[PDB]
Amino acid sequence: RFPNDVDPIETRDWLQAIESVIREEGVERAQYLIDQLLAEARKGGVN
Amino acid sequence: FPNDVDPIETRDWLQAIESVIREEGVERAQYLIDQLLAEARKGGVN
Amino acid sequence: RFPNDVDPIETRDWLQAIESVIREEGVERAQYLIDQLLAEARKGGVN
Amino acid sequence: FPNDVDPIETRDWLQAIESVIREEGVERAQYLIDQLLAEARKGGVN
Amino acid sequence: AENDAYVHATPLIRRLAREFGVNLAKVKGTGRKGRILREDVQAYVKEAIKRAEAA
Amino acid sequence: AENDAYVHATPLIRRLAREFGVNLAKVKGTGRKGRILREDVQAYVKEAIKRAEAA
User: Fold this and answer.
1) How many whole angstroms separate alpha carbon D45 and alpha carbon D33?
2) Which residue of F has its CA nearest to D29?
3) Residue F1 CA: distances (Å) to CA of C43, F4, F7, F11
4) Are D35 and C15 in contact (CB under 8 A)?
5) F26 within 8 A of F47, measured Cβ to Cβ
6) Pick the CATH number of E3-52 from 4.10.320.10, 2.60.40.10, 1.10.510.10, 1.20.5.440
7) If you write DSSP's letter for every residue of chain E in order, what string do you get?
8) Residue of A4, A10, A14, A16 best to disrupt the E interface, most CBs of E under 10 A
9) Do the Cβ atoms of E51 and F52 come closer than 8 Å?
């Protein structure tokens, strides 16, 4: 499906970033951000 | 319409997924979105 | 013995810092830093 | 004499414990040293 | 506005730039596909301090 | 050299200053006993960029 992660440092930034939101602002806020991201990505033809 | 407690921050996340799509393409963004959901599940998002 | 931590944000910085050393540089390096710190603190009359 | 892989970094840790002693006193430095050892034990230092 | 005119950076580097008042439009990215890396922000800030400490 | 002449900061803030080329001797600390906080470094860097983007 997916190749080997072409850029794991990039991926780590994303995962760390959402980790920080969860710890500092909580799961409800991380849920809000992920919902807004999915809706944004759909505009660019990404599911 | 749920409340955004920090739209300046939200704007940066949304600009970040836009720039992945623009510079790296849909497949890369699908992979990162898949990775992001999985990490969020480990936290409690779903 | 010790009062309530007078400044937990300060303490958190120290604990986070040594945490990062351990993850990025390993337990041998964190051991080295702690050894050098103990020797330094002793000069200031701290055990 | 063991090797210091990054003395600029070591210097900053040592200047940090000096400044606790100078500005906050020996008792505060003892507390922080006690806290630091305990966290390092959780990692593997001892 | 072609792709080179746009900032590319992870949410982590965007947050770092926000926290330190860095306009990422002014930072040259050296990561994959021109992405702005932590080291690019560091170099930019180091140089800004230099210019400011020499005004 | 009295205590006010000396920098007081945790190893975390000293590392941050190293990473971004900040001379902590130039940063006014607002934490307990004058310790230099993350927010003090942020304010300093924001202002340095300002002076540099206005040279």
Assistant:
1) 13
2) F10
3) 19, 8, 11, 22
4) yes
5) no
6) 4.10.320.10
7) --GGGS----HHHHHHHHHHT--GGGS---SGGGPPPHHHHHHHHHHHHHHHTT-
8) A10
9) yes
